């Protein structure tokens, strides 16, 4: 078929599976969230937290679909439609090595309801506690054995992709021995190979070194709000592709509709990008489609906490808060945007 509507799979969606209701979870998880203290406002801060009732919810936005869990196997449906309605054929799984069993349970569900659509999940490697890479090549063991063959599971020409959160924690030697062919526990060559996706955060005397000397397959800018880093500013991004090309990588920049954390972080204001109807987002999708780049992420799917979420909103006031919302667009408008965008990426590559 050629109707423009099909998903494509060199578009990934940053997807947040923590959410959890009183009834699936025990509570209703990220929902209900601390407050964070200003960082430059002092000891003694009681900044206190976010209760997660109806009228009062960790976002500064309000979802369609309500307090949801993200283990309830009906919203993970809704969810596959949504992505579907997107055309974004890749969802990247936030992934914090919880080890218990009701990660492994939510994962198992999100692949079922992925597949049941076609979609592909890979998995987005958050700094949990104590990272290194001998435990990330464990990790990256125990997803690929786990999940590598189930039918949802994402490859790239063969391999799997992992998107690597604040890999710049990490010192380059390190990573060396990971990722270099001739590296002490390398991955390259072996069943457990993968396209490896760094942070790239701050200016390029940093960065091309970094990716280079760490053996990065490639790079992602993550941040939703523009000019927050060097990365997340588009108007690098022509440069930062020329680079990419010349040296072999991979330039998955990072899109976003917009961004607002001040529910849960009061003092980090500078950092609040306005959705202005969608104009945003057209104007940030445009520049990474304009530098010509293989492959696109969008931060999020459903951050909900960082307001950078594409997932149905609604207008809601309650007693507590006056949420913000699509405005003058209606709640599937990022869906469809994002499906217009798609289209247009495709026509470019
Ligand atoms: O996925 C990468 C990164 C994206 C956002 O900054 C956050 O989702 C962050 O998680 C931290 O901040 C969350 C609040 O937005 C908080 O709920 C988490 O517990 C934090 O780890 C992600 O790492």
Redesign the pocket.
């Known amino acids: 078929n050629n109707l423009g509507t099909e998903l494509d799979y060199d578009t990934f969606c940053?997807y947040?599976d923590?959410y959890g209701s009183e009834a699936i979870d025990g509570q209703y998880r990220?929902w209900a969230?601390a407050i964070?203290p200003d960082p430059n406002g002092g000891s003694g801060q009681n900044p206190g937290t976010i209760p997660g009732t109806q009228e009062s919810i960790?976002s500064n936005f309000y979802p369609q679909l309500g307090r949801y869990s993200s283990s309830d196997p009906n919203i993970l449906t809704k969810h596959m439609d949504m992505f579907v309605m997107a055309r974004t054929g890749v969802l990247a799984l936030?992934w914090?090595n919880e080890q218990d069993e009701t990660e492994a349970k939510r994962i198992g569900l999100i692949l079922d309801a992925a597949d049941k659509k076609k979609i592909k999940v890979c998995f987005?490697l958050?700094?949990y506690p104590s990272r290194n890479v001998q435990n990330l090549r464990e990790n990256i063991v125990k997803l690929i054995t786990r999940y590598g063959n189930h039918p949802a599971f994402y490859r790239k020409d063969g391999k799997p992709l992992f998107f690597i959160?604040?890999s710049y924690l990490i010192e380059p030697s390190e990573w060396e021995k990971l990722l270099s062919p001739g590296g002490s526990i390398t991955i390259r060559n072996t069943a457990y190979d993968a396209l490896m996706i760094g942070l790239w955060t701050s200016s390029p005397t940093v960065q091309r070194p970094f990716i280079l000397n760490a053996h990065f397959d490639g790079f992602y800018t993550?941040?939703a709000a523009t000019g927050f880093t060097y990365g997340s500013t588009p108007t690098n991004w022509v440069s930062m592709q020329k680079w990419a090309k010349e040296n072999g990588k991979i330039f998955i920049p990072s899109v976003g509709p917009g961004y607002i954390?001040t529910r849960?972080?009061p003092w980090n204001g500078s950092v609040i990008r306005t959705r202005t109807d969608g104009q945003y987002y057209d104007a940030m999708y445009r520049k990474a489609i304009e530098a010509g780049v293989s492959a696109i992420s969008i931060?999020?799917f459903n951050?909900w906490?960082?307001g950078?979420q594409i997932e149905p909103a609604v207008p809601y006031t309650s007693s507590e808060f006056t949420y913000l919302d699509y405005e003058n667009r209606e709640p599937d408008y990022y869906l469809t945007r994002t499906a217009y965008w798609v289209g247009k990426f495709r026509e470019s590559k």
Do not use: C
Request: hydrophobic share 30%; charged share 25%.
């Open positions: 940053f947040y923590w990220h969230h964070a960790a936030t914090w987005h958050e700094p959160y604040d993550y941040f954390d849960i972080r931060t999020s951050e906490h960082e950078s």
